[PDB]
Amino acid sequence: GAMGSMERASLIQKAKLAEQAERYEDMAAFMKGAVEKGEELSCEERNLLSVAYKNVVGGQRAAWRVLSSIEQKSNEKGPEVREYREKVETELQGVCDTVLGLLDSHLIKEAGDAESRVFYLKMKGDYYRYLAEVATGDDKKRIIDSARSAYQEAMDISKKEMPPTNPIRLGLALNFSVFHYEIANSPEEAISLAKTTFDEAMADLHTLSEDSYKDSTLIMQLLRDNLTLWT
Amino acid sequence: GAMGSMERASLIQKAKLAEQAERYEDMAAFMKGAVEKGEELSCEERNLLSVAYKNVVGGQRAAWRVLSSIEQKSNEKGPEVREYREKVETELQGVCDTVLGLLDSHLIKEAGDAESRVFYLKMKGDYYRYLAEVATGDDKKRIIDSARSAYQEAMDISKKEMPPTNPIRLGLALNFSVFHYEIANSPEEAISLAKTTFDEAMADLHTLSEDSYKDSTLIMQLLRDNLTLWT
Amino acid sequence: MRPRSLE
Amino acid sequence: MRPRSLE
């Protein structure tokens, strides 16, 4: 595509510049260009891909929720609120389909190490989750199953291959727990997964260095914040 | 253009929705579509046009300053920092040229009342100012003169037609003072204009209602903040 | 209120 | 530090 003429190293360098400039649409276009070079991503490069698209879809999701709330109020006027909510929805769907397409071409297929495979399957679950947030009816059921499946494959590798404090494993469990609570209408599964994840990580903190301890405890605090909200 | 098939009232309604959703690129596209219907803008609609483009160009200017600072550091590596600064610069220029084009086709020509004419000439000065921030050399001189000229025409109408507390007149003087300080290398003209504007508004506050008093004093505090910074 | 997903 | 223009 449009980044085909740029060197892979220049795309990564410009993604970092775009992050510093808070230009996340540019950051995502540069990282898409880097993925489309066909080579595997390093840990740092996977992080850049995730930061870029999380910030782009996060603005879309925030805007969709504001518009959905106004639309719900207006149905308790004209077609304009629905049309504009639909416009933002379609743009958000397009960003999710773009990320899913990168994961399917061919990041997950080539990812053999647990840290890369769990990261990408988690991201697959997250973007199907964002599709599920705006989906209705039977469409919704198949999208929810696609999220659940990706998260479950990621969970099964993470429990076999990573210690319970590994930040990737922790963030997966955090997000799968949010899936269960908000998407799958399974609050008890959400609370059980957050509590078991927190308790198993607590028992493994003794093994960590100061820096690894700070990384793991930061994510554990998010689990605790959700358990406080839910119980 | 792309909004040609949408009703003017629907474009204004969607600009308001986009503001609530913090979707300022969409807000600016809707307001451009509304201007291109060819009719004059009301006071509220002029405000929507200004909010939309100020937020779009404000993100561009912030990103340009981050990239310009990194580029300056790197010249105290490769072409990538310059290329990406140039990309953001060209996009910012394009937004300024779009706003200038709307003012020239044909908002200023049809604006006869002081509140509409001063508003649009101020905006002409502001967008030439944003062009001047990124311009070099002789280009810079002609862009600076275009800003100065627009601001001066706006100032001459504002002093004849508006009281010294009028918020449009106050915001014009604030921004022209910033022009003198930051662009024209005239700090003494900047300080003189901010002080005279503040003192003349103070003497006219007695004429105002509670709501008009709050509107005028808010802008006066920005003048005072700049005089504190500069003296 | 919405729960925290990974930041 | 940069001066305030109209918000």
UniProtKB/Swiss-Prot annotation, chains A, B:
Present mainly in tissues enriched in stratified squamous keratinizing epithelium. It is found in: Cytoplasm; Nucleus; Secreted. The keyword Transcription regulation does not apply. Transmembrane segments: none annotated. The keyword Protein transport does not apply. GO terms for cellular component: cytoplasm; cytosol; extracellular exosome; extracellular space; nucleus. CDD domains: 14-3-3_sigma. It holds the Pfam family 14-3-3. Keywords: Cytoplasm, Nucleus, Phosphoprotein, Secreted, Ubl conjugation. GO terms for molecular function: cadherin binding; identical protein binding; phosphoserine residue binding; protein kinase binding; protein kinase C inhibitor activity; protein sequestering activity. The modification Phosphoserine is found at S10. PANTHER family: 14-3-3 PROTEIN. Homodimer. Interacts with KRT17 and SAMSN1. Found in a complex with XPO7, EIF4A1, ARHGAP1, VPS26A, VPS29 and VPS35. Interacts with GAB2. Interacts with SRPK2. Interacts with COPS6. Interacts with COP1; this interaction leads to proteasomal degradation. Interacts with the 'Thr-369' phosphorylated form of DAPK2. Interacts with PI4KB. Interacts with SLITRK1. Interacts with LRRK2; this interaction is dependent on LRRK2 phosphorylation. Belongs to the 14-3-3 family. This is 14-3-3 protein sigma.
